[PDB]
């Protein structure tokens, strides 16, 4: 008897839902009087499954109404922890621990990627005689990002970027950048939100109307 | 024996399919053979405690691996990474240690519209007209249903083409034009039938300077 993990690492996007698995030998059928499943992370209990039931009282405050153990999977020899709406606090080392005659644990590490991939934009005519426009790009993510404006002819341009803490998601940043430029209908520009360590670029295409 | 007969697998993910066999004592890997195939193409040939990767078919060159730490437990776990629609079919496993026996496992590949890209364009701030867009790929064809925070169905413009990335899939992009203000919430729902399946992104109208 030993627990096995088909996936050692999980990379999961902010706000989405994850299923992290642990597999254990089940020759015949589950004797739920003998079955225990314990999920935790950084010494905080997520799930304690005993005598066929989830002990939700011992569940840590953080995970209330978010985490649960898929029970259809238990019959197959698979203890699947599903957590919904992944925060940046859910980055950590997750211990899964099962006792069924023998008893053994495995580790699973989770990283939470919070990309600047929901990009909002605005294009305004500031002065139609000089055909000066104001382009704007906003997005949210973690950590801080810089905005990089480029034209269709690959010219870097000077934008004005304003980084604040997000009024939606406490831990994320709200990055808004503004480009003033002279241009005409159908010309194409790009704003590119750049995170670092490791580098990651998300880019939206603005079409001047 | 096989705990799971049927696997429903996501497109582009990893799958782990399992065949169990009796193991009273420990593994003499000179005596052990494991063979995995689908449609007479070899996926894995494991012999003398080593993967015989020259017999492997082109299709599975660096994708197919046998989880070696789970051989110790009496369970041959075929793992294939980056699942295409071509991986739908019937997989045979055979193992010979002392005795010999085979099991068949059916695999179906779902390609859900669960990676939804979004963007919000402020068209005219005077009227406060915004242009919300959602796009995704999947199979089969899916409709998009736009709804407001109080769940009224709104009129949209949806465009469906064959995907350029993977031509068997479809690209579904939908745009909604609506007069609205900062912090109002909208939903774009990718729906697909026989059987029904819903995936929805939540779009929040931003505060721009």
From Swiss-Prot, chain A:
Q: Which cysteines are joined by disulfide bonds?
A: 22-96, 137-191
Its BP terms in the Gene Ontology are: adaptive immune response; cell surface receptor signaling pathway; cellular response to lipopolysaccharide; immune response; negative regulation of activated T cell proliferation; negative regulation of CD4-positive, alpha-beta T cell proliferation; negative regulation of CD8-positive, alpha-beta T cell activation; negative regulation of interleukin-10 production
Location relative to the cell: Cell membrane; Early endosome membrane; Recycling endosome membrane; Nucleus
Upregulation details from the record are: Up-regulated on T- and B-cells, dendritic cells, keratinocytes and monocytes after LPS and IFNG activation. Up-regulated in B-cells activated by surface Ig cross-linking.
Tissue expression, as annotated, is:
Highly expressed in the heart, skeletal muscle, placenta and lung. Weakly expressed in the thymus, spleen, kidney and liver. Expressed on activated T- and B-cells, dendritic cells, keratinocytes and monocytes.
A cellular-component GO term for this protein: actin cytoskeleton
- Extracellular-side segments: 1-209
> Where in this chain does the record put each Ig-like C2-type domain?
115-207
Look up keyword Transmembrane and say if it applies: yes
For whether the record's keyword set contains Ubl conjugation, the answer is: yes
Q: How is the subunit organization of this protein annotated in UniProt?
A: Interacts with PDCD1. Interacts (via transmembrane domain) with CMTM4 and CMTM6. Interacts with (phosphorylated) STAT3; promoting nuclear translocation. Interacts with CD80.
What function is annotated for this protein? Plays a critical role in induction and maintenance of immune tolerance to self. As a ligand for the inhibitory receptor PDCD1/PD-1, modulates the activation threshold of T-cells and limits T-cell effector response. Through a yet unknown activating receptor, may costimulate T-cell subsets that predominantly produce interleukin-10 (IL10). Can also act as a transcription coactivator: in response to hypoxia, translocates into the nucleus via its interaction with phosphorylated STAT3 and promotes transcription of GSDMC, leading to pyroptosis.
Tell me what this protein is called.
Programmed cell death 1 ligand 1
Organism whose genome encodes this protein:
Homo sapiens (Human)
User: Span within the entire protein?
Assistant: 19 to 227 of 290
């Amino acid at each position: 008897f030993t627990v096995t993990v088909p996936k050692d690492l999980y990379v999961v996007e902010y706000g989405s839902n994850m299923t992290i698995e642990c597999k254990f030998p089940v020759e015949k059928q589950l004797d739920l009087a003998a079955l225990i499943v314990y999920w935790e992370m950084e010494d905080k209990n997520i799930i304690q499954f005993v005598h066929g039931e989830e002990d939700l009282k011992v569940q840590h405050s953080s995970y209330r109404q978010r985490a649960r153990l898929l029970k259809d999977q238990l019959s197959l020899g698979n203890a699947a922890l599903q957590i919904t709406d992944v925060k940046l606090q859910d980055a950590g080392v997750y211990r899964c621990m099962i006792s069924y005659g023998g008893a053994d644990y495995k580790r699973i590490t989770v990283k939470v990627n919070a990309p600047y991939n929901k990009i909002n934009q605005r294009i305004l005519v500031v002065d139609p005689v000089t055909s000066e426009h104001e382009l704007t790009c906003q997005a949210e993510g973690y950590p801080k990002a810089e905005v990089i404006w480029t034209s269709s002819d690959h010219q870097v341009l000077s934008g004005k970027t304003t980084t604040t803490n997000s009024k939606r998601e406490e831990k994320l940043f709200n990055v808004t950048s503004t480009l003033r430029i002279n241009t005409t209908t159908n010309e194409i520009f790009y704003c590119t939100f750049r995170r670092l360590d490791p580098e990651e670029n998300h880019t939206a295409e603005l079409v001047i109307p």
